[PDB]
Amino acid sequence: DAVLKRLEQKGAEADQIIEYLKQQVSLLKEKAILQATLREEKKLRVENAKLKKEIEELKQELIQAEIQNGVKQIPF
């Protein structure tokens, strides 16, 4: 009879240490997915800009070949 409320204040202090240690899991697993998916989203910035680089080089390869027999206008 006098050992239920002693075991209860062991398993209710368990919810205590559970949901603290759970909130360090639930916020370390946030930094993991954040640190990764962030530095990939600035690695789309190294593709998307390198894309415009090899895009602008190519519009001026066409426009040097579409004057070869065609008309060009300004500017623009």
């Binding site: 190519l58 040097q64 070869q68």
Partner: protein, 659 residues
């Protein structure tokens, strides 16, 4: 009974507290500051919506490159566009490696060769690791695309990439420059290029120095007219001198009736040096002279009437020069800026660039240690005021895209200072408009010295034309005084020989260097000079003429007959015919016209190696009339002739046909 019934009522109303919380978050939460982008969605979307661009673009590059052409092709430019494909595809993590696509030369290293593999091995960082250019080069030979020109590809050096050409393509343009004219495709659409060239000082006698900038000046001017640039020619004449005040003061005495009676004044310099003697000696003259050089700055009606008449004699002597050299020109010497020069002097105090020194106002270029004088000690404007208030009008009114200044190599300190200063106040940018100084050497006689004559001061240029058609005639009565059609071929020869040699032996010699005027080496019938060109040029329009082939029999046969290139020497000539726009591009860039003369001579060298080798017309021995005409080898002598004739139109040399 009801805590289950009303909890739903606090659950029915809590819904709106969630529904409307999500509602007003849609409005005041989005972008309230400098940046704007969804990274999860959009940055994964611009990656495809623009990766779809390289494909829709490449498909449109394949459309307009497929459908040709009505022109010629800068062969070397379209090779750096198939290596531009090949090399950066072979190595996707390099930005701009060298593209040394040169000819060179004798079909030994093939026709063309690219020494770029070095500049990928030479690109030797990432901690000094040995990368042999040979494995570098052949990694580009398996990663070079498909084209309309290349037959075989080779390696033979440390990393040398020697290239060979497909016969099929080489001859396809030889016909192209034949049926549709030998023309270059509208290069640089609607750009405006003005050229400052002739520009001698009025009432001073125009000389050989100011003549070198007349032939170099208008030869360039017709280049950009041929390329497709909207060119306008400028005569930066010197009708704004403090010396012009010295003239009218001598006029007010010589002729008090200049305003009502036309003045009988013959030579400019004898009248000039008459005003000069008045100048140095007299004191009443010199105080009348510079008191009227400020009257004319003020647009004085009576004083200006004098000034207008003065030029009409030194400019009748000038149009006696342009008529011969066929120099089309538009005169705007410093006389034109006397209005706006005053508004430029003002701009450099408003900007606070001008420093106060010695009763003068001078400006300091951060590139040299030599300042400019824009304000004289007597309120007069100089040369630094002129070409600086004129480099703005050629920038903000004419709105040029590039201007070429053709004066000697002695005023280079001046121009690269007016340039740098122009950029300073912020009129143009060194890479939005390329303002470049077309400099040249000094005129020397056959005695290495100043030019020239017995005395000889400044040699009058009209006599050069006089001793230019006498020299060109004494050789042309040996013995063509009979073969020549009286009016036609005497005129056509001696007026093409005279203005041909003179223009040429100065454009053959390097522009930047000292031109040695040698009237015997310039008209040497056996030399690089136009003496040999115009003679061997009629000689190519004579292999066709001596075969009875009229203006229709060649212009139809060209449209139908394909050209053969099996022999080694006809392959050596067939190449140089199409080098023509690869030589014209180099001179659009470096503006050294001395590499065109090297080329117009280059095809005539491989021609005498050809016309002697493969027989154009060859029947027969023991009877010599007919027949063995190789029409495809007759199209060659119509191609070489159409090329040089448009290349002569550029040099300024009027071509001849019969001689």
């Amino acid at each position: 009974d009801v805590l289950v019934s009303e909890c739903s009522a606090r659950l029915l109303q809590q819904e709106e507290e969630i529904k409307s919380l999500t509602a007003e978050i849609d409005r005041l939460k989005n972008c309230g500051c400098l940046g704007a982008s969804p990274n999860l969605e959009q940055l994964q979307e611009e990656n495809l919506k623009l990766k779809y661009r390289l494909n829709i673009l490449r498909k449109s590059l394949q459309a307009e490159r497929n459908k040709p052409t009505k022109n010629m092709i800068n062969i070397i430019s379209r090779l750096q566009e198939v290596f531009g494909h090949a090399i950066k595809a072979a190595y996707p993590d390099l930005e701009n490696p060298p593209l040394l696509v040169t000819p060179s030369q004798q079909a030994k290293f093939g026709d063309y060769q690219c020494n770029s593999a070095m500049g990928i091995s030479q690109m030797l960082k990432t901690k000094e690791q040995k990368v042999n250019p040979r494995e570098i080069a052949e990694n580009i030979t398996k990663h070079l695309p498909d084209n309309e020109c290349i037959e075989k590809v080779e390696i033979a050096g440390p990393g040398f990439i020697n290239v060979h050409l497909r016969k099929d393509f080489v001859s396809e343009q030889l016909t192209s420059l034949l049926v549709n004219g030998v023309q270059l495709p509208a290069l640089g659409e609607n750009k405006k290029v003005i050229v400052d060239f002739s520009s001698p000082n009025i009432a001073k006698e125009m000389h050989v120095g100011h003549l070198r900038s007349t032939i170099i000046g208008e030869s360039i001017s017709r280049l950009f007219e041929f390329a497709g640039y909207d060119v306008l020619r400028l005569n930066h004449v010197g009708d704004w001198g403090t010396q012009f005040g010295m003239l009218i003061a001598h006029l007010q005495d010589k002729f008090p009736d200049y305003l009502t009676v036309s003045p009988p004044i013959g030579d400019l310099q004898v009248f000039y040096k008459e005003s000069k003697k008045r100048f140095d000696t007299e004191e009443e003259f010199k105080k009348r002279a510079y008191q009227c050089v400020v009257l004319l700055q003020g647009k004085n009606p009576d004083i200006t009437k004098a000034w207008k008449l003065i030029c009409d004699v030194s400019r009748q002597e000038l149009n006696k020069i342009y008529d011969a050299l066929d120099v089309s020109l538009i005169e705007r010497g410093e006389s034109f800026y006397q209005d706006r020069m005053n508004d430029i002097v003002k701009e450099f105090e408003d900007r606070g660039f001008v420093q106060v020194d010695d009763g003068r106002k001078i400006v300091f270029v951060p590139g040299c240690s030599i300042p400019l004088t824009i304000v004289k000690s007597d309120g007069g404007y100089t040369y630094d005021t002129s070409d600086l208030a004129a480099i703005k009008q050629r920038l903000f009114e004419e709105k040029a895209d590039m201007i070429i200044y053709v004066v000697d190599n002695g005023q280079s300190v001046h121009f690269q200072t007016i340039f740098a200063a122009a950029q300073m106040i912020g009129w143009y940018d060194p890479k939005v408009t390329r303002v470049f100084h077309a400099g040249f050497g000094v005129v020397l006689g056959e005695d290495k010295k100043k030019f020239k004559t017995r005395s000889g001061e400044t040699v009058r240029l009209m006599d050069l034309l006089g001793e230019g058609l006498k020299r060109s005639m004494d050789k042309l009565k040996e013995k063509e005084r009979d073969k020549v059609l009286t009016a036609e071929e005497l005129n056509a020869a001696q007026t093409s020989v005279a203005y041909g040699c003179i223009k040429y032996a100065d454009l053959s010699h390097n522009r930047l260097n000292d031109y040695i005027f040698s009237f015997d080496k310039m008209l040497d019938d056996r030399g690089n000079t136009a003496a040999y060109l115009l003679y061997a040029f009629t000689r190519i329009r004579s292999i066709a003429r001596l075969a009875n082939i009229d203006e229709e029999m060649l212009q139809k046969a060209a449209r139908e007959t394909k050209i053969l290139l099996d022999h080694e020497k006809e392959w050596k000539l067939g190449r140089c015919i199409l080098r023509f726009p690869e030589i014209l591009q180099k001179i659009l860039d470096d503006l050294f016209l001395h590499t065109l003369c090297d080329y117009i001579y280059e095809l005539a060298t491989a021609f005498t190696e050809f016309y002697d080798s493969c027989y154009c017309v060859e029947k027969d021995r023991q009877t010599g009339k007919i027949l063995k005409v190789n029409m495809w080898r007759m199209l060659l002598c119509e191609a070489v002739a159409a090329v040089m004739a448009k290349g002569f139109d550029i040099l300024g040399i009027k071509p001849v046909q019969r001689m």
